[PDB]
């Protein structure tokens, strides 16, 4: 009942904020999209931002699931190639207009830098650390502190995606950032 | 007139010192006016609210940060662009570890300015020095020819994340030394020199 209200509201908000952005859609329009009364909604979420926080969580899960089930589809033979696939996977997925609007444009404003880092690192650190660990185990990456390299790589890839998202010419920004990330990764790795 | 100009400077200096020591959250504007030796009225004429005064403090602290970074690189005796990049990475870790820069720039600024405001300030003060350093390394053949603005923006995301990671760490001394190792390995892997 509570879970079904929550699910209906998250799906509705994810769709409409996805299309027009957080700032353009009010909570009552979301309630109607969800087939929920203002009252049922305010009982599950104090305000707009609180609902936005559950939308971010659900979108980040999908984004990480999409990326894992895209690296697996790359058929990378080594950890080094899996890191390269994972970088491409993130450029592919952050180019999704919903991920661009909710995660790259609205999330930083609504959550702030501290909040966004918490969410970003809650969802990506483990996958990033695991990928670094495998490259070390295979001799393709120098033994080196794993958590700090992971943190830095996630700051770079998040910033890469934000640079593309707000570029005058995103098609050009993608191809140029892709060249830059390929050089950064090739400079991080062993051969 | 001249007293209005002196009030502005006194309030920025006083707010910079007290917010530096205790956070933005822990010092009200009345204690800042007293520290400055001026009236709430002279203060409200120069700054509409607390946040407005905080924005002038951020500007003055960022100027000191970039000046201290340029000083540290020039002081390193770096003969090449590659060595200047090595100095500049160390200089950023050194300067962001200053407790005033940690409190005002890493913890308070993103909250008080918000995302758009803070990014605009951060980019205004760091992009130019970062782009210039990359350009020199390319001109010297010590860095592969590549798009300058995108490499700069990626590197700034890495260095900003590095600084935040150390600022909030359980063991900042360890975080600094380990992040320093990782950044140095990354750039030693890109630099032809
Ligand atoms: O929702 C997400 C996607 C973005 C934005 C927030 C955080 C988790 N970010 C992770 C970006 C990332 C991290 C590691 C790798 Cl290998 C690739 C990409």
For the record, give the distance between the C-alpha atoms at the N and C termini of chain A, rounded to a whole number: 56 Å
Number of helices of chain A: 8
| Assembly form of the protein | homodimer
Largest sheet of chain A, described in full? none
- Helical fraction of chain A: over 70%
Small ligands present: ligand GNK
Largest interface: A-B, 36 and 33 residues
SSE order of chain A: HHHHHHHH
What coarse outline of chain A follows from CA principal-axis ratios?
Answer: elongated
Helix-strand category of chain A: mainly alpha
- Domain module count of chain A: 1
Number of strand elements of chain A:
0
Radius of gyration of chain A: 18 Å
Query: Hey, roughly how much beta strand do the residues of chain A contain?
Result: under 5%
Keywords (chain B): DNA-binding, Transcription, Transcription regulation
GO molecular function (chain B): DNA-binding transcription factor activity; transcription cis-regulatory region binding
Organism (chain B): Mycobacterium tuberculosis (strain ATCC 25618 / H37Rv)
Pfam families (chain B): TetR_C_41, TetR_N
Description:
2 copies of one chain form a homodimer. In chain A, helix 1 packs across helix 6 (97-137), helix 4 (48-71) crosses helix 5 (79-94) and helix 7 packs antiparallel against helix 8. In chain A, 81% of the residues lie in helices and 0% in strands. The first copy, chain A, has one domain (1-191). With 191 residues, chain A is mainly α. The A-B interface holds A 108-109, 112-114, 116-117, 142, 144-145, 147-149, 151-156, 158-160, 162-163, 173, 176-177, 179-181, 183-184, 186-189 and B 110-111, 114-116, 118, 144, 146-147, 150-151, 153-158, 160-162, 164-165, 175, 178-179, 181-183, 185-187, 189-190. The structure holds ligand GNK. Residues 60, 63, 86, 90, 103, 120, 123-124, 128, 131, 154, 157-158 of chain A line the site of ligand GNK. It is classed as dna binding protein. The entry lists the keywords helix-turn-helix, tetr-family, complex, inhibitor, drug design, tuberculosis, ethionamide, DNA binding protein. The assembly is dimeric.
């Amino acid at each position: 009942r509570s879970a079904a209200t929550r699910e209906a509201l998250i799906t509705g908000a994810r769709k409409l904020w996805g299309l027009r952005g957080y700032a353009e859609v009010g909570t009552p329009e979301i309630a109607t999209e969800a087939g929920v009364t203002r009252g049922a909604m305010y009982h599950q979420f104090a305000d707009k931002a609180a609902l936005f926080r559950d939308v971010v969580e659900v979108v980040e899960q999908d984004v990480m699931a999409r990326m894992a089930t895209l690296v697996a589809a790359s058929g990378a033979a080594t950890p080094a190639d899996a890191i390269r696939a994972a970088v491409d996977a993130w450029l592919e997925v952050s180019g999704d207009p919903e991920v661009r609007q909710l995660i790259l444009l609205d999330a930083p404003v609504v959550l702030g830098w501290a909040g966004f880092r918490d969410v970003a690192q809650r969802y990506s650190l483990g996958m990033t650390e695991q990928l670094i660990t495998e490259a070390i185990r295979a001799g393709q990456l120098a033994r080196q502190p794993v958590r700090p390299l992971a943190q830095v790589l996630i700051g770079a890839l998040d910033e890469a995606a934000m640079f593309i998202a707000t570029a005058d010419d995103p098609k050009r920004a993608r191809r140029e950032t892709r060249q830059v990330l390929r050089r950064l990764i090739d400079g991080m790795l062993n051969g």
